[PDB]
Design a protein that fits this description.
The structure is cut from a larger assembly and holds 2 copies of chain A (about 45 residues). Chain A is mainly alpha-helical and about 45 residues long. Chain A contains 3 helices and no strands. The interface between A and B is medium-sized, with 17 and 17 residues. Chains A, B: This is DUF3375 family protein.
Chain lengths: ~45, ~45
């Protein structure tokens, strides 16, 4: 059986749009923004 | 101290090169190759 593949590749191609995190890691400015968000959120859960 | 940031951002900007996986996730063809490698390696550890 290989039907799962034709669903698996579709799942992955879809997820590499729409779902943010994968879009975020792929856009040039990702390192900067990850650093900034992490350093900020590291010291406050309540906004 | 904010100095840790000036090392943290450098760590991240570095890792966004050299280290493959973050390079792999970022190049368009990533979904296809991820699917292929996963489906292949899923059924064999010895090559």
């Amino acid at each position: 059986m290989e039907e799962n593949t034709r669903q698996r590749t579709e799942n992955y191609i879809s997820a590499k749009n729409q779902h943010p995190a994968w879009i975020l890691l792929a856009t040039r400015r990702a390192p900067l923004v990850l650093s900034c968000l992490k350093t900020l959120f590291e010291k406050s859960h309540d906004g």
